[PDB]
Design a binder for this molecule. Structure first.
Ligand code: CO
Ligand code: NI
Ligand code: NI
Ligand code: NI
Ligand code: NI
Ligand code: ZN
Length: 231
């Protein structure tokens, strides 16, 4: 290979010829730098972004890395729930003219979570799939609401043309010792929601998540099995 690229305070790992993971870091007192991962997808003369970094300035650095390494307009960004690690850098997307999308419920939750809402709301059909009219130009991003889990609003994304699915903070890796921050969790539905994400992207073999390296479908099984203990 070539290694994972460092650009300002971020790290970018290429996962497929048109997909990269972005990683940004925040110090949390007690246990050092906490990585948060999102995605970057090159499609049909544009770039799509999934999740912000923790901060505006870090998010502005993602845009700069895109401009330097890819050099295609960012058509849109989708954010996967209203917490700092996924939505902390909304202001930087908006300053850069980028159309932003989140679950309607994430936009309703954003103020109480201290987040800036996306500019557009996604709504989801009864079977969990995004309503296409509310997700124009998403191209290969297939967006699915699996039910409440890590938060009430958490949504997940598959990348058509690849073996990649992104569970965001709903899914922990296959050796995680707990389900992490449950302050906003739905402990009743968590397990079913994790299993629904797995059934929605049944062919995905690389599962990207918010706080560690990409794992296999074992991350989904282990997560659901941990969530079973909560209900
Ligand atoms: Co801000
Ligand atoms: Ni608009
Ligand atoms: Ni419909
Ligand atoms: Ni229910
Ligand atoms: Ni396990
Ligand atoms: Zn979260």
């Amino acid at each position: 290979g070539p290694g994972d690229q460092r650009f300002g305070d971020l790290v970018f790992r290429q996962l497929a010829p048109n997909v990269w993971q972005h990683t940004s870091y925040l110090d949390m007192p007690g246990f050092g730098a906490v990585a948060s991962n999102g995605l970057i997808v090159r499609d049909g003369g544009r770039v799509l972004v999934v999740d912000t970094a923790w901060t505006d300035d870090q998010t502005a650095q993602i845009l700069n890395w895109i401009k330097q390494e890819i050099n295609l307009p960012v058509a849109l960004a989708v954010v996967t729930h209203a917490h700092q690690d996924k939505m902390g850098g909304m202001d930087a997307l908006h300053a850069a003219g980028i159309a932003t999308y989140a679950n309607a419920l994430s936009n309703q939750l954003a103020p109480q979570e201290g987040m800036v809402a996306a500019q557009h709301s996604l709504t989801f059909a009864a079977n969990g799939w995004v309503e296409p009219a509310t997700a124009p130009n998403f191209g290969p991003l297939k967006v699915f609401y699996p039910g409440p889990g890590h938060t009430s609003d958490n949504i997940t994304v598959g990348i058509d043309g690849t073996d990649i699915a992104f569970g965001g903070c709903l899914i922990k890796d296959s050796k995680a010792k707990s389900l992490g921050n449950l302050g906003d969790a739905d402990t009743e539905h968590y397990a079913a929601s994790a299993r629904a994400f797995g059934a929605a992207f049944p062919k995905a073999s690389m599962i990207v998540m918010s706080h560690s390296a990409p794992d296999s479908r074992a991350a989904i099984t282990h997560t659901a099995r941990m969530a079973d203990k909560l209900r």
